[PDB]
Design a binder for this molecule. Structure first.
Ligand SMILES: *[C@@H]1O[C@H](CO)[C@@H](O)[C@H](O)[C@@H]1O
Ligand SMILES: *[C@@H]1O[C@H](CO)[C@@H](O)[C@H](O)[C@@H]1O
Ligand SMILES: *[C@@H]1O[C@H](CO)[C@@H](O)[C@H](O)[C@@H]1O
Ligand SMILES: *[C@@H]1O[C@H](CO)[C@@H](O)[C@H](O)[C@@H]1O
Ligand SMILES: *[C@@H]1O[C@H](CO)[C@@H](O)[C@H](O)[C@@H]1O
Ligand SMILES: *[C@@H]1O[C@H](CO)[C@@H](O)[C@H](O)[C@@H]1O
Ligand SMILES: *[C@H]1O[C@H](CO)[C@@H](O)[C@H](O)[C@@H]1O
Ligand SMILES: *[C@H]1O[C@H](CO)[C@@H](O)[C@H](O)[C@@H]1O
Ligand SMILES: *[C@H]1O[C@H](CO)[C@@H](O)[C@H](O)[C@@H]1O
Ligand SMILES: *[C@H]1O[C@H](CO)[C@@H](O)[C@H](O)[C@@H]1O
Ligand SMILES: *[C@H]1O[C@H](CO)[C@@H](O)[C@H](O)[C@@H]1O
Ligand SMILES: *[C@H]1O[C@H](CO)[C@@H](O)[C@H](O)[C@@H]1O
Ligand SMILES: *[C@H]1O[C@H](CO)[C@@H](O)[C@H](O)[C@@H]1O
Ligand SMILES: *[C@H]1O[C@H](CO)[C@@H](O)[C@H](O)[C@@H]1O
Ligand SMILES: *[C@H]1O[C@H](CO)[C@@H](O)[C@H](O)[C@@H]1O
Ligand SMILES: *[C@H]1O[C@H](CO)[C@@H](O)[C@H](O)[C@@H]1O
Ligand SMILES: *[C@H]1O[C@H](CO)[C@@H](O)[C@H](O)[C@@H]1O
Ligand SMILES: *[C@H]1O[C@H](CO)[C@@H](O)[C@H](O)[C@@H]1O
Ligand SMILES: [Ca+2]
Ligand SMILES: [Ca+2]
Ligand SMILES: [Ca+2]
Ligand SMILES: [Ca+2]
Ligand SMILES: [Ca+2]
Ligand SMILES: [Ca+2]
Ligand SMILES: [Ca+2]
Ligand SMILES: [Ca+2]
Ligand SMILES: [Ca+2]
Ligand SMILES: [Ca+2]
Ligand SMILES: [Ca+2]
Ligand SMILES: [Ca+2]
Ligand SMILES: [Ca+2]
Ligand SMILES: [Ca+2]
Ligand SMILES: [Ca+2]
Ligand SMILES: [Ca+2]
Ligand SMILES: [Ca+2]
Ligand SMILES: [Ca+2]
Ligand SMILES: [Ca+2]
Ligand SMILES: [Ca+2]
Ligand SMILES: [Ca+2]
Ligand SMILES: [Ca+2]
Ligand SMILES: [Ca+2]
Ligand SMILES: [Ca+2]
Ligand SMILES: [Mn+2]
Ligand SMILES: [Mn+2]
Lengths: 440, 532
C-alpha cells in the first residue's frame, strides 16, 4: 500500500551510536499498545544487530559504521504486534542503501608486469598492458576512477621518458626514440594506479621492458687495410683472413657476416665466412696468371644474413694482394710443327729453326733445345737457337721409321729458372721422294 | 495500516524556504507512474500552500515559517494517482504539530489594578492580587511561566518597599510595617510580568493600593486647661467649651469625640459634643450649690466614638468651675410655727419669737421681719428679732376668720442682698378655748297658744367648747309658777321644753355650763287664741 522511501546511510558513518534512521508507526497504535520489531538480515539475521527498533516508539536505529564493500543494501522488515499477541500489520519492507566512500585504494592485478619491445621501436608504438582494480563503485563515484602514471624508469637513459602508460587504459607505449638493446636492453618501471582520477589513493607496481634485438649494427673490419700474397697460378689459395666485429646479438643472422668483393671483374676471388668467428677467408676462384697483373688492390665489404635495417652504410676492407711469379714451362710455338723435306737432304745442313716461347717474363731467362725422340737418328737440333740439322742420311723409302712418308720426332726446350720446366714441341718431318718409290 | 508519525516544525523557523518535511511513496509506484498530492488546511484549504508536495518525488515541504499561536497543528492527506487518473492508494492522514517559541511577552489583564489595605495591618497580611497571561506553550514550555515582580513603589516611604508580590501568584501583601493612612493614604506600584519563570520577556502594569482608616489616633484637647463661672441654682448652663483635635477620618466614629467627666460622682455636670465642631460644651445636669461647694475642678477626658486601636491612652483637660453665689431667700425655722396660746392673751403680751435662717453665707445679710397677713390685726412683730406680740383682743370663737381652732398669720423676713430675697413662715396661733361666753335660749321671739298649748323646745347656745358648754343648767328666777314648766327635754342638757301650766308675758331665764350664769331677758312670747 503506502510505504517508506529507500533509506541511505553513508558507508563508515562514524560518530556516536546508535544513530536514528526513521521511526515507523501503525495507525492501530491507539487501538491497542503495539510492539514493533524489525527482521531480515542486518537485524536478527547476520549481520545481526546492525539495525534495531525501539519496540515502544518504532524508531529504527543503526548501531555501527556501515561498510558497503561488505554489504551495500540491507533488506529489513517491520512488524506491529498488539500487546495481546495478535499481529496488527502485514510486515513493511524497509530498504537501507549504504552509500559509497573512497575507502579502498586501487591495486594492480600483478605485483610485477613484464613485457618486451623492438630495439627500433616507432615512438607511439605499443609495448605492454598494465592494470589495477578499485573496490568502491566507479558506477556511482570517482572513487574507483583509476589513473595510471609512471613514476620511475630504470635506467633513466638515454632519456628519462622512454615510455608512457595510457592514463586510463594502462597500456604502456613508446614515447621517444632511443631504445637501444645494445645500450639499455631492460627497463624497469614503477607504474602507479590512483583512484579519484589520479587525485585519490595511489598504489604502485612494477613493469619490466626488455628491449630486444634488431639488426641495427653494421659489421666492422679491423683494420681497413689487409695485406698478403698468392702463388700466381694457384687456386683455392688463402690470401688473407680479415677481421670484423658486428655489435648486434651474437650468432644471430643480424650478426654473422656476409663479405663481398666489389672490384673483381674476372670472378677470380672468393672470400668465404668462417662460421665460428665470421672472419673473411680471402681465397682465389681462378688461378691468378701473374704476367697480366702483378698485384691486386681490392676492397671487400661486410653485411649480415639478415638484411640491414634502414639506411645501409657497410664497412670495407682493402686487401692489397700480391701474386708471385712462378716458373712455368716454355711453350713451343707452334706445338705441332709440319715441314716438307726432300728425303735426299744434305747431312749437316740446316732444315728449319724450331723455337719456343718464354712465358715467365724474367728479363733474365734462357732456353735449351734438345731432342729425345729421334727414332732413326737423322736429326740433331742446335741446343742454342733451336736450329735443326740432319746429322745422318735420310730416306723416305726407309720403312718402319717413316710412318707414312712423314717422320715424327719429339723436341724439347727445357727451362732456366726455379724448377726445371721442360716444354715439349713436335716436328713432323714430311719426306717426299727424291720399285718402293712414289709416282712418278 | 502503516501510517507516518507526526512531524513537528518549530514555529517561526528562519531558514531557506521551502523546506522538506518528509518523502512519501506508494509501492505501486513501479507498476504505474504515480502522482503525489496532498490536501487540507495549509495545503489546498486555507492557509493555502503553506505545505506542498512534489508530485513526482512525493516530497512534503513547507513554504512559510509556521506560527503555533495561529495554527498549532496541521492535518494533511496524501493522494496517489497513476498517470492514468486512477487513484492508486487511499489518502494518508499526515499530522503536523507546530512546536512553540517564546515569542509572546505576557500581559496584565488590567492596565491598572486597584487595591485597599487597612492602616497599620500586620506585615505578612495580604492586600490584593494582580495577574498576567502568556500566549505561548504552557503545557510544554516555560515560555508561559510568569514571575510577578514589583518594579517601583510610590512613594518610597516610610520605607523603600512596603509591599511584596507572590512571585508566581500575583498576590501583593504587606512586606513590612509603617503603613499610615495619616501620612500616605495611597501607594502606587509598578508590577512586572516576565516569562521563562521571570527571566524571559517582561511587561508591566500599575497597582494602586490605598491605605484605609482605623481609629489609630486619639482625640487631643487643643487647650488642656479651662475655666468657667456659673450661677448657683440654674441647670445646664454653659461653663466651658472643650476643644479637641483628632487626626483620623473627619466625621467618622473613629473621629467623633466623646466627653466624660471623671470627677462625676453625683453627676452635677454634663458635657455634650457639637456634632460638627466636635467641641465639648460643658453644661450642668443639676443645680450647683455655692454654700456647699465653692468651686469645682474636674477632669474631663475625650475618647472616641469607636474603640481605639491598641495602646489606648485617653486625653484629659482640666476645667475649673467657679460657682456664683446667688442671694437665696431666708428660711423660717420652722416654716410652719405652731403655738398654743389662750384666748385671754393680754394686749401687749408677746406670743413667740419666729425667726428665719440666712441661707446665704456671705456675712452682709440683714434679715428684717415684717408681718404679711393677719385679717384681724391681732398681731405685731419686731422688724429686728421677729418677735410677735399681740396688739388687740383675740377671740377663739371669732368664727369669721378663726375658721378652725387656729388663727393663721403670715410673717415674712426680707433682707438686703444683691437682689431682695424673702422667706415666709405661718404663725399657726391656736387660741385655746376660754369660757368667756354665757348660755342663751334659741327661740327668743317664740310664740304660744292660749287654749290648747303644744310643747316648745328651746335650744341653748354656747360658743365655747366643752367643758364650757354641755351640762347646761337653767332656771327661772322671775316667776314661772304662774303657768310655767321647763323640762330639759334631752337626757344631757341640749335644750328644754317649755309650756303653759295653766289656762302676753316676758320670762327671765337663767342658764349655765360650768357656772357661767346669764339670765336671758328676751322671752317676748305672745299667747294667742288658737286651738293648738
Ligand atoms: C599495446 O598495444 C598492442 C596492440 O597494437 C597490444 O598488443 C599490447 O598488448 C599493448 O596494449
Ligand atoms: C611501489 O613503489 C614503491 C616506491 O615508493 C616501491 O617501494 C614498491 O615496491 C612498489 O613498487
Ligand atoms: C665499402 O663497402 C661499401 C658497401 O658496404 C661500398 O659501397 C664502398 O664502395 C666500399 O667499398
Ligand atoms: C681500402 O682502404 C682505404 C683506407 O686506407 C679505404 O678508403 C677503402 O674503402 C678500402 O677499404
Ligand atoms: C490573571 O489572574 C487571574 C485571577 O485573577 C487568573 O485567572 C489568570 O490565570 C491570570 O493569572
Ligand atoms: C420678698 O417678698 C416680699 C413680699 O412678700 C417683698 O417685700 C420683697 O420685695 C420680696 O419680693
Ligand atoms: C585491468 O586491465 C585488464 C586487461 O588486461 C582487465 O582484464 C582488468 O579487468 C583490469 O581492468
Ligand atoms: C721462336 O720463334 C717465334 C716466332 O714466332 C718467336 O716468337 C720465339 O721467340 C722463338 O724465337
Ligand atoms: C722436363 O723434363 C726434363 C728432362 O730433360 C726434367 O729434367 C724436368 O724435371 C722436367 O720434367
Ligand atoms: C714435354 O711433354 C711431354 C708429354 O707430352 C713430357 O713427356 C715431357 O716431360 C715434357 O714435359
Ligand atoms: C707434339 O705433338 C704430339 C702429337 O703427335 C704430342 O704428343 C706432344 O705432346 C706435342 O704436343
Ligand atoms: C490575599 O488574601 C486576601 C484574603 O486572604 C485577599 O483579600 C487578597 O485579595 C489577596 O488575595
Ligand atoms: C510598565 O513600565 C514601562 C517602563 O518599562 C512603561 O513604559 C509602561 O507604561 C508600564 O507602566
Ligand atoms: C485623663 O485622665 C483621667 C484621670 O484624671 C483618666 O480617667 C483618663 O483616662 C485620661 O487619661
Ligand atoms: C489637667 O491638668 C492636670 C494637672 O493637675 C493634669 O494631670 C491633666 O492631665 C490635665 O492636663
Ligand atoms: C431664729 O433665728 C435665731 C437667730 O437670732 C436663732 O437663735 C433661732 O434658733 C431661730 O433659727
Ligand atoms: C413667702 O410666701 C409669701 C406668700 O405666702 C410671699 O409673700 C413671700 O414673698 C414669700 O415667698
Ligand atoms: C405657712 O404655711 C401655710 C400653710 O398653712 C402656707 O400657706 C404659707 O405659704 C406658709 O408657708
Ligand atoms: Ca569499506
Ligand atoms: Ca566504499
Ligand atoms: Ca578507492
Ligand atoms: Ca642500436
Ligand atoms: Ca641489434
Ligand atoms: Ca648487423
Ligand atoms: Ca702467368
Ligand atoms: Ca719458363
Ligand atoms: Ca709466370
Ligand atoms: Ca730413297
Ligand atoms: Ca727415292
Ligand atoms: Ca727410281
Ligand atoms: Ca507566534
Ligand atoms: Ca509561541
Ligand atoms: Ca512568552
Ligand atoms: Ca497611623
Ligand atoms: Ca486612622
Ligand atoms: Ca480617634
Ligand atoms: Ca446655697
Ligand atoms: Ca437672702
Ligand atoms: Ca446663696
Ligand atoms: Ca369666745
Ligand atoms: Ca371662748
Ligand atoms: Ca360658756
Ligand atoms: Mn545517518
Ligand atoms: Mn524544520
Amino acid at each position: 500500500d503506502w510505504v517508506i522511501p529507500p533509506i541511505s546511510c553513508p558507508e563508515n558513518e562514524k560518530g556516536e551510536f546508535p544513530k536514528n534512521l526513521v521511526q515507523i508507526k501503525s495507525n492501530r497504535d491507539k487501538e491497542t499498545k503495539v510492539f514493533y520489531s524489525i527482521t531480515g538480515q542486518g537485524a536478527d539475521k547476520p549481520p545481526v544487530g546492525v539495525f534495531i527498533i525501539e519496540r515502544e516508539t518504532g524508531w529504527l536505529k543503526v548501531t555501527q559504521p556501515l561498510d558497503r564493500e561488505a554489504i551495500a543494501k540491507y533488506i529489513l522488515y517491520s512488524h506491529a504486534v498488539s500487546s495481546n499477541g495478535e499481529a496488527v500489520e502485514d510486515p513493511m519492507e524497509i530498504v537501507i542503501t549504504v552509500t559509497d566512500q573512497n575507502d579502498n585504494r586501487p591495486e594492480f592485478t600483478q605485483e610485477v608486469f613484464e613485457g618486451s619491445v623492438a630495439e627500433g621501436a616507432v615512438p607511439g608504438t605499443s609495448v605492454m598492458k598494465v592494470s589495477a582494480t578499485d573496490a568502491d563503485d566507479d558506477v556511482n563515484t570517482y572513487n574507483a576512477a583509476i589513473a595510471y602514471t609512471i613514476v620511475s624508469q630504470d635506467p633513466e637513459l638515454p632519456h628519462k621518458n622512454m615510455f608512457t602508460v595510457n592514463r586510463d587504459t594502462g597500456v604502456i607505449s613508446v614515447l621517444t626514440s632511443g631504445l637501444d638493446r645494445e645500450s639499455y636492453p631492460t627497463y624497469t618501471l614503477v607504474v602507479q594506479a590512483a583512484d579519484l582520477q589520479g587525485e585519490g589513493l595511489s598504489t604502485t607496481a612494477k613493469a619490466v621492458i626488455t628491449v630486444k634485438d634488431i639488426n641495427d649494427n653494421a659489421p666492422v673490419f679491423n683494420p681497413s687495410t689487409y695485406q698478403g700474397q698468392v702463388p700466381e697460378n694457384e687456386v683455392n689459395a688463402r690470401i688473407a683472413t680479415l677481421k670484423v666485429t658486428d655489435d648486434d646479438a651474437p650468432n644471430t643472422p643480424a650478426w654473422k657476416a656476409v663479405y663481398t668483393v666489389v672490384n673483381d671483374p674476372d670472378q677470380q676471388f672468393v672470400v668465404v665466412t668462417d662460421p665460428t668467428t665470421n672472419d673473411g677467408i680471402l681465397k682465389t676462384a681462378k688461378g691468378l696468371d701473374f704476367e697480366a697483373k702483378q698485384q691486386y688492390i681490392l676492397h671487400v665489404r661486410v653485411e649480415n644474413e639478415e638484411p640491414f635495417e634502414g639506411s645501409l652504410v657497410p664497412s670495407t676492407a682493402t686487401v692489397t694482394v700480391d701474386v708471385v711469379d712462378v716458373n712455368e714451362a716454355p711453350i713451343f710455338m707452334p706445338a705441332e710443327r709440319r715441314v716438307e723435306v726432300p728425303e735426299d737432304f744434305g747431312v749437316g745442313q740446316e732444315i728449319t729453326s724450331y723455337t719456343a716461347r718464354e712465358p715467365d717474363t724474367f728479363m733474365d731467362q734462357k732456353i735449351t733445345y734438345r731432342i729425345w725422340r729421334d727414332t732413326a737418328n737423322w736429326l740433331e737440333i742446335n741446343p742454342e737457337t733451336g736450329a735443326i740439322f740432319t746429322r745422318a742420311e735420310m730416306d723416305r723409302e726407309d720403312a718402319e721409321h717413316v710412318k707414312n712418308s712423314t717422320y715424327v720426332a719429339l723436341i724439347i726446350a727445357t727451362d732456366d729458372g726455379s724448377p726445371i720446366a721442360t716444354g715439349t714441341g713436335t716436328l713432323l718431318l714430311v719426306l717426299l721422294d727424291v720399285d718402293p718409290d712414289l709416282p712418278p
